[PDB]
Amino acid sequence: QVQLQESGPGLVEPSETLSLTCTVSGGSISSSNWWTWIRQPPGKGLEWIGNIGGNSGKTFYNPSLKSRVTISKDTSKKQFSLRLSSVAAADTAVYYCARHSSGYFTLYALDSWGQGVVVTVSSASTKGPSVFPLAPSSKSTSGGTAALGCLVKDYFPEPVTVSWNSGALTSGVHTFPAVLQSSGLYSLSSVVTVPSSSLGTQTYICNVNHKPSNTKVDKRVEPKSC
Amino acid sequence: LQKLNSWDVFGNWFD
Amino acid sequence: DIQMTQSPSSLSASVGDRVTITCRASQDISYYLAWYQQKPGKAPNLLIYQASTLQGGVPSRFSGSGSGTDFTLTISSLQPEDFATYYCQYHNSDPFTFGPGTKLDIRRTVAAPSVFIFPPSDEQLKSGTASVVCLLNNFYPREAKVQWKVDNALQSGNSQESVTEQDSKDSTYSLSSTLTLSKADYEKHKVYACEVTHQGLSSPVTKSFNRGE
Incomplete structure (x- = not known):
């Protein structure tokens, strides 16, 4: 069924905008699913960021982030996306996309997940080993x-x-x-x-x-x- | 701010 | 809205056990509770949703119960690959709050480490730095003490260490300790030694080498 592949940068400098994209196979973006973003700061637990209804386009956001977060979708490209503006050191985290399955009137859970992208917010430069x-x-x-x-x-x-x-x-x-x-x-x-x-x-x-x-x-x- | 309820779940089955 | 707590925050259990961990919501969330397993370095995997519905593909030994505010996840016939952090989640309305997680470790018999030491490579020395690596392989429990000695002088402040996750079959750990010196400091001394104390060792083990042999 649905499989998710995440993409995006590993390093963003403070005050810039972080963008991530999830590519979906095995299903349409336009569906009763709620396409979701989750993060996990280092040493911490999981934090729901927000979602978007695959068919309706209705978005819901975590109140600790809503002014800086935008989630969007493009059915013809089989993708949905997260934008986090004005990033700071505290946004350093592993970011995941996920599929939240739905019933007719209630939701199920996060049954499919992308692999995760490690995102660091820092002014230091990238350096190979x-x-x-x-x-x-x-x-x-x-x-x-x-x-x-x-x-x-x-x-x-x-x-x-x-x-x-x-x-x-x-x-x-x-x-x-x-x-x-x-x-x-x-x-x-x-x-x-x-x-x-x-x-x-x-x-x-x-x-x-x-x-x-x-x-x-x-x-x-x-x-x-x- | 609006909260995700059964009408939102149901509405997301259309189109 | 919803505050989620989990108890215990960590535990160890033995292979074959039937282990229960708990979750509580600060408000009635009916049965809209999900449980995930998260392996180190991986996306979580859904185990249970609607408090007691087992997700397709999940082993039959996972089960959940509860409704309202108090919930439980039970793992029967605990397997060595079941070490993980387990998270509960309210899964029917925003902000879909996750609990803080419960870390489950697998308990086994005490096993002493095999100890190995690696001098710096000539390559790295050419760059002006010397890393000496001490490796502790396949031991239990996790707690170990590594002390570095250079010409029998105890070192402090110039080493870092890292520990793997548990092995999914034999439930052991490994640990790596790196001592970092400048090339010039490293060339001033002869004997480099890693000293290891651990519950499974009757006396400390010292692995050493003479620089340039």
Whole structure:
């Protein structure tokens, strides 16, 4: 049935306007659904922003945002949109689109959701990561197990994603939440444990994706040469 | 400001 | 309009348990209560709406009850992948208020960490900074203490740490601690060591290396 794909910028500067768009497949915008926007500030719970009736175009907005929020829809483009004007640091949040299903006289709930867009409000500039290897060695080996990884450092804003060998290596992978350094940039590590007997035969490559900078970087991770 | 009620739900079935 | 509260704010339970969490509305909301599961880093998933209607595709072990102001979500036969934050929501009129969430962790037997240390790469050193990484793998409970020592001098103020979410099968955590120094400071010292204390360890574990080996 309905599937939702969200789009929009990862970084907005204060006092500017944030715009997000959701593209719908499996159904018409013009329908008894209420197309919805939700956000989640860092460390906090979920907050309903507002909705728009797919057929009627009636909009409802959260009173803590209504003067700055506008929701609109375009059936011929299979999309609906959110505009948040005069953004401030407190609008930093993950933003979601969702489908609120309806009955004839009462509503059901948010049964379909977009994947979320991480939005940061800041005057700092976007910066892609530097990727450094965490090489396997004797001091990263336990039994027949070796740990290795990638240090993804000095990027802004969130998020980055990491896969290993294009997603063919998932067992034993740990990608840690990012920390905010005193420089104002983020840093995370991704590690994987593998058979020690594979270091001489198998290639290990971390694929780092930072969409706010359109950065994709593949880093080979090998034992050192001392 | 107006609140979403059963008339709004019902009206959104038309067109 | 509507204020929503949830209780407890967090809990742990064991695999196989039947666990109940609660939601209360500050006003009568009839049965127009929904429950969502939110995994770390993901959009929420609807579990229940109209207080007790199970959404299609959701496992049979989730159920809800209640009407008026007091509601409950019950997870029977609790599974290790059921760790999450659970949110209630008034789903029939604005502002469709969500509760504050209830964080559910899965309880298991104590497991000591495997500890690994990574010297800075030559690449990073060329840039003038040195990051030393200490990794604690697959331990339980979450609480661990990592102390850095450089030539047997306790460090403070120059490291940060991060912890993964629970593993959806074995319910363990992993933790990464990074010590950050300048290239020049890093080249002034020999022995770099991560010291780890944890409920599953009889004495602290120290993993170390000599710079340039």
